[PDB]
């Protein structure tokens, strides 16, 4: 019975691996697209909603300036993003439709999800009911079990990176810091409020930090605010290490117990790491109502169904200065991204 899931990952790891050892590469070109708007603009990031020319399909094209990625020492990570991204496949994993590059940029043509960054919707609602926090949570539990099975580590779990597709389910994005390792790593990456203590103290860490961020995420969904916060990141890091949590009057004694384990400084006791595995999470009382297979198939009534105004410029979001994307007449950083 549970051999289904035991026999599922196998099939998926084989599927994953084959793609990870023989990456897909340069599978479309800029000109085969028409830029529609700029959905964001980062220090090196950038997401320009586009429409595929030959088919009228819309994609969220992510554009990374080559020279910046390097300056920010994000080469390995940027390559980690593409490589892991073209191999994985999961219901809650935004699909990278196309990839390619030119003289000045690297392009990752992501699937466009017209639902709504869970952030805005969360800050708008204030906080999600436990039942609802559970709904999204569950999907994360599963998506990690998928990722982790492939020796993958997300490292950037937070509402922001969670999109709510039209059916009301989640699609994870932003794999900038995802990496495939079996030992333990050391880079300092993630978002202040979601960093496990072993990252802050830079001890060296594993997939355990992902189960920590879940706690933080679950807590921030149910509370309405992160379990650890302040003005400057230096402080955040402090509140975290001291490791003392306080729950809201309205938290079920069941949420707190679960959260008391996810947000656990002690690696030998925290859920997700221990021998029994993801079942100390999956089998917790707070997840009693949850039917794990119901969700994978997505046969569950979503709590919130975004009023999406169809494909493209539905409505709202926010406007940025439509910066042109230039392609130098010279190739920039050839050897570096050769495998991109």
């Amino acid at each position: 019975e549970q051999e289904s899931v035991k026999e599922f990952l196998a099939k998926a790891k084989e599927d994953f691996l084959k793609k990870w050892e023989t990456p897909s590469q340069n599978t479309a070109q800029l000109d085969q697209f028409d830029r529609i708007k700029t959905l964001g603009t980062g220090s090196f990031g950038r997401v320009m909603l586009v429409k595929h020319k030959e088919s009228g399909n819309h994609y969220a094209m992510k554009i990374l300036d080559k020279q910046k990625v390097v300056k920010l020492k994000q080469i390995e990570h940027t390559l980690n993003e593409k490589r892991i991204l073209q191999a994985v496949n999961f219901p809650f994993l935004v699909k990278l439709e196309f990839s390619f590059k030119d003289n000045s940029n690297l392009y990752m043509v992501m699937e466009y999800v017209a639902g709504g960054e869970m952030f805005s919707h969360l800050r708008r609602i204030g906080r999600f009911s436990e039942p609802h926090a559970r709904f999204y949570a569950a999907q994360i539990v599963l998506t990690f079990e998928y990722l982790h099975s492939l020796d993958l580590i997300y490292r950037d779990l937070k509402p922001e990176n969670l999109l709510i597709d039209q059916q009301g389910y989640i699609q994870v994005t932003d794999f900038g810091f995802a990496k495939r390792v079996k030992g333990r790593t050391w880079t300092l990456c993630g978002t202040p409020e979601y960093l496990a203590p072993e990252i802050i103290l830079s001890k060296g860490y594993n997939k355990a930090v992902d189960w920590w961020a879940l706690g933080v995420l679950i807590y921030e969904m149910a509370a309405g605010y992160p379990p650890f916060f302040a003005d400057q990141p230096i402080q955040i890091y402090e509140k975290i290490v001291s490791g003392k949590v306080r729950f809201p009057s309205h938290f079920s004694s069941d949420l707190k117990d679960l959260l008391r384990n996810l947000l656990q400084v002690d690696l030998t006791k925290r859920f997700g790491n221990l021998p029994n595995g993801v079942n100390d999470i999956k089998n917790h009382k707070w997840f009693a109502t949850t039917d794990w297979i119901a969700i994978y198939q997505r046969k569950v009534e979503a709590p919130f169904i975004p009023k999406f105004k169809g494909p493209g410029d539905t409505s709202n979001a926010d406007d940025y200065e439509e910066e042109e994307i230039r392609v130098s007449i010279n190739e920039k950083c050839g050897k570096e991204f050769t495998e991109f």
Partner: peptide, 20 residues
Amino acid sequence: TTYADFIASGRTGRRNAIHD
């Protein structure tokens, strides 16, 4: 109230990953 203190702060908008 913890909620207001949160709201009063500046880390209530879209947060940026660290890696400068």
